[PDB]
Ligand SMILES: *C(=O)[C@@H]([C@@H]1NC(C(=O)O)=C(S[C@@H]2CN[C@H](C(=O)N(C)C)C2)[C@@H]1C)[C@@H](C)O
């Protein structure tokens with residue numbers, strides 16, 4: 001009497017299959033969910049329950065689309081639609097493997113990475129270490145990552161947030177890349193004292209150098225020119241504190257204190273990336289706005305759905321959001337090249353030279369942010385999120401990469417330190433090579 005719907009499949013942007021169903025026998029007939037990639041993108045895809053309905057991930061959140069509706073006799077069975085993701089399995093597989101061995105090498109508790117298409121904001125890879133395998137029983141995998149931290153688990157971004165300040169001073173005409181500043185080693189601001197990560201007297205950093213060397217004092221001086229209201233406004237335009245709408249269950253909104261509630265010291269913290277939280281996707285989404293000539297396209301991971309007859313409906317495109325002008329966005333991309341610039345004499349070296357890839361105009365930003373000690377309700381001294389976000393490339397934006405490491409003891413490649421810059425190098429360089437992308441004067445970070 002019952003006519004069963006056949007579960008639809010989940011495929012990547014090139015119709016490469018991630019999840020699909022085969023017919024078997026046991027209550028006699030029995031559908032078997034196949035995951036040919038094992039753990040590949042399982043943070044996104046999810047897994048099935050014993051009854052063949054989704055248990056978690058997109059298998060669950062899109063279950064209605066994928067399961068269809070059983071028929072009877074007459075009511076015709078509505079077979080499940082196939083879901084096409086924006087993911088590129090080749091990119092996802094490379095990125096997911098690099099994330100796992102950045103975790104092993106660095107000693108971090110967890111690692112995640114997001115790659116967005118620069119122009120559309122489509123999610124090309126989203127990965128975390130320790131990803132579970134939905135072809136095996138989930139009750140055997142308590143030691144595994146079953147979820148999707150890149151959207152669910154916010155963190156404080158540290159100096160990667162300084163893209164907001166850079167964008168605001170350039171957009172409002174308050175400074176220019178070549179302005180020579182005078183940056184003391186510390187200032188008193190809103191009742192507190194902010195210090196640069198290195199002791200120094202007054203340095204003649206250019207505005208480019210303030211972000212290239214990640215000077216907190218320089219960042220806050222420039223942020224004083226912007227003001228709290230224009231700064232908070234730019235935070236919101238970059239999409240912070242708000243869900244992206246990417247189409248994945250468990251998305252966190254992060255946390256941005258609304259301006260009417262700031263304490264006297266909020267403005268001394270937010271511009272350098274403390275006192276607010278965001279997900280890795282929001283973080284990467286900020287750099288996508290600058291990559292896309294100032295126009296933020298909220299990221300999306302559903303590309304389309306295919307009906308059982310074979311007809312294809314594209315997912316509707318989210319509306320653009322103008323954050324800064326194209327001229328401003330191009331200026332910020334060029335400035336962020338200083339972060340990855342090498343200088344043997346040290347003077348004109350950024351904080352992330354290992355993130356540079358010779359022959360390409362890589363641009364990016366390093367971050368280190370203290371975490372909150374759960375017992376004192378205060379910051380740890382020596383527990384950090386490490387972050388990096390960057391654009392490949394400044395002159396031709398194609399890819400946007402965001403990375404977070406939860407408290408590594410070493411670099412992402414295993415050398416002493418605690419930088420994610422080498423992970424960006426690996427991924428960004430590989431994206432250029434695999435597409436045979438073809439290959440000016442040094443930037444001035446520090447004047448005389
Ligand atoms: C931003 O994350 C903080 C400052 N900017 C940077 C930076 O982007 O590199 C740092 S961390 C810098 C690099 N590694 C040095 C170090 O002493 N360690 C190995 C821990 C210092 C600044 C702290 C901003 C939030 O203060």
Ligand SMILES: [Co+2]
Pocket residue numbers: 074075
């Ligand atoms: Co009827």
Ligand SMILES: [Co+2]
Pocket residue numbers: 425429
């Ligand atoms: Co290399």
